[PDB]
Amino acid sequence: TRSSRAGLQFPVGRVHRLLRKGNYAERVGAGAPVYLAAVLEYLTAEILELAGNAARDNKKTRIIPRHLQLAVRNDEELNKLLGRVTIAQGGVLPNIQSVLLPK
Amino acid sequence: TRSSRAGLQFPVGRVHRLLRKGNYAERVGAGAPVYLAAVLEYLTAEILELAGNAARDNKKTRIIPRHLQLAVRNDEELNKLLGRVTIAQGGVLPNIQSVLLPK
Amino acid sequence: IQGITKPAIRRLARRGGVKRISGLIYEETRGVLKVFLENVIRDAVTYTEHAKRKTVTAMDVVYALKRQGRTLYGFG
Amino acid sequence: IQGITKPAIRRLARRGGVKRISGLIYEETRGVLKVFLENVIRDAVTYTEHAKRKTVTAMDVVYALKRQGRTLYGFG
Amino acid sequence: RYRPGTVALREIRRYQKSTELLIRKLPFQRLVREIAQDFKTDLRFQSSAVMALQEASEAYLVALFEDTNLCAIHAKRVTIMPKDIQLARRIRGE
Amino acid sequence: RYRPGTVALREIRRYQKSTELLIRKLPFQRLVREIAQDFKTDLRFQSSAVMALQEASEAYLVALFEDTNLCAIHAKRVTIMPKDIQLARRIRGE
Amino acid sequence: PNEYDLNDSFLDDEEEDYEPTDEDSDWEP
Amino acid sequence: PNEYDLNDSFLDDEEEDSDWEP
Amino acid sequence: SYAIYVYKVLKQVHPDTGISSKAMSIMNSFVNDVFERIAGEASRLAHYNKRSTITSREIQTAVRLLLPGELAKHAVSEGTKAVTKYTS
Amino acid sequence: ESYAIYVYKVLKQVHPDTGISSKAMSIMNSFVNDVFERIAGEASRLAHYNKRSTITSREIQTAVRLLLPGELAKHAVSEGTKAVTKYTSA
Ligand SMILES: [Cl-]
């Protein structure tokens, strides 16, 4: 497949399809859905790697929303990228202002 | 003209082409630019009405950026519409926090 | 709106890291939650009505939240 | 960066309605102004380079601002 | 022995650790119902749509309380007060 | 006689009725040039791009100073301080 | 019991045979 | 004189308040 | 650009008022900004509903989504009135 | 609109012995759809600014630099360019 030739798990054909169907331009360049698919897989791998770390740092074998939230909020760059995003059931990063803690 | 046929001064034909050349959908029905032009003409008249007022309130015969800004920031609804907009050379609405003035 | 209880609001403030809460906070919070829900529900209904439906879906709410800059993950 | 003088910073604080200004404000404002300018210039350069030009236009600056949610009126 | 700060701090840790919805579900549904039916009398909701609104609403409140907390600390207080909510909202743009 | 408050209020009135850019133009130009030429050496600007940048920058700082003032007043001060600028920026999301 | 009241006439579920449950489950292919 | 210096080689104005009239 | 049509509307609302040249550029940005917000949401609405055509219905709902309260009420009435007059 | 099987495939490469919950898979799907729309959106803006009719990998690349912070952008751009190269290499 197109994704095989690109070394990707993400569907290059679907991405191409959605580029055309979402009325983004009259035309799609042959490289465009490969590039975009690669970027989406990269970002997915980043979150899944850090979330799996948080899951395993808690001796858990499964990623749940909490772990995606922990991973995103502890990575300065993902946290900025998903700054206006609510991860349902993610809770908050545990953190108490230092002034509220016993001296 | 298509505009005079809808009672508008804003140009319906020109709004139609920009809607077409603008990657919004694959077709644009005939009523869409008429409706859109009417709305742009209405919003224009709102701003210009209030800004002309701020001009004459300062004994001016000509609208300059300052008057648009005064018109926008004194009208509750234009202020929400333009809440994230910088009008160059508009200045600010004169206002001092009451706590800073002699009681 | 009084159904949103004081314990419930206090718990929300706990998760927000709040160590002490004035008694006046609860009514204030109820007003703020009401404004938030009115604003989102109004846009949600607009999406629902545009589609000529009479039941608001999670997708309608997801869209309403996006139009207000509050993207929500988990309901698409 | 020190070319943004104390009086210029004072004037902006005045237009902002500020009545008194700690001496520490001036260096803090210069830092903030520089972060703001670098963020917008970085994006305007990316637009300019994308278009294979090497002169930043006002339009390029307008697009950078709008990319950051700071729509500017009066330059196109 | 009283020690309220100890009690408060334990409550912060408890609720920062959990992800459950903190407003009870039936009162929330009934609040959504009243606002919605005040808009359009015959309007209905899917339950998933009510829960989407509840996730979004609680997340909004928690984040607001974080900012509100910082406003009170700014004023050298540990007790949050309406004017702290008001300041946070004012600067947030609401 | 020393009337800092009266001098302050007069300046507030003067610069709030005015729309002129308040940072001198040549210094702003050199600052944009310093930052721009650090990104790419042979980069050039149009003069209207420098002015666009200046309008946007002054409007940003003026509004930040407004929020800063509210933070200071919140703490029962009329004197703005760096912690006020920082609180405003944090609640603003910067 | 801390659940929504699905007998509320205000709720119109699409499935509307099954009751929703709150439990997470393993996602598998 | 508080103006921009157009002889700056950093400025490139090759491509680029009165009453508006038709 | 829209300057001519801005000027024509100015003369309906304030016949004895002029507009400076930098104020006309403001108005031109305003028009294009509002255009882009409505058309963008109109495209979003059509895509959400699997519709290939943007109609007056998509413009209207976008005006309802993007305009505050009373401005929306009047914008909708102006637009619906223009469309019906157009179809005659 | 649903990428779950692909998300799962990526999960098994970075954390072979870790599973994912269905609620968490929904989050990831919202994420991929969100990031897709942001990039495709900006790529469409870019092409329109430049009076061009086509979204090419250049517009995806520029959109990535504008939208992703810092080092995410550099790694994204590197992953994207590399994938376009492998796509048509022996
Ligand atoms: Cl069941």
Numbering used by the authors:
A (entry chain A), B (entry chain F): 16 to 118
C (entry chain I), D (entry chain D): 26 to 101
E (entry chain H), F (entry chain C): 40 to 133
G (entry chain J): 459 to 487
H (entry chain E): 459 to 474, 482 to 487
I (entry chain G): 36 to 123
J (entry chain B): 35 to 124
Please quote the paper that reports this structure:
APLF (aprataxin and polynucleotide kinase–like factor) is a DNA repair factor in nonhomologous end-joining (NHEJ) repair of DNA double-strand breaks (1–3), a critical pathway involved in immune responses and cancer biology. Nucleosome assembly requires the coordinated deposition of histone complexes H3-H4 and H2A-H2B to form a histone octamer on DNA. Here, we show that the acidic domain of DNA repair factor APLF (APLFAD) can assemble the histone octamer in a single step and deposit it on DNA to form nucleosomes.
This truncation does not affect the binding affinity of APLFAD for histones (see below). APLFAD imposes both a steric and electrostatic block at the binding sites of both nucleosomal DNA gyres. In addition, aromatic residues of APLFAD provide anchors that make extensive van der Waals interactions with the histones. Overall, APLFAD makes use of multiple known histone dimer binding modes: the cap-anchor and the R-finger interaction for H2A-H2B, and the aromatic-key motif for H3-H4 binding.
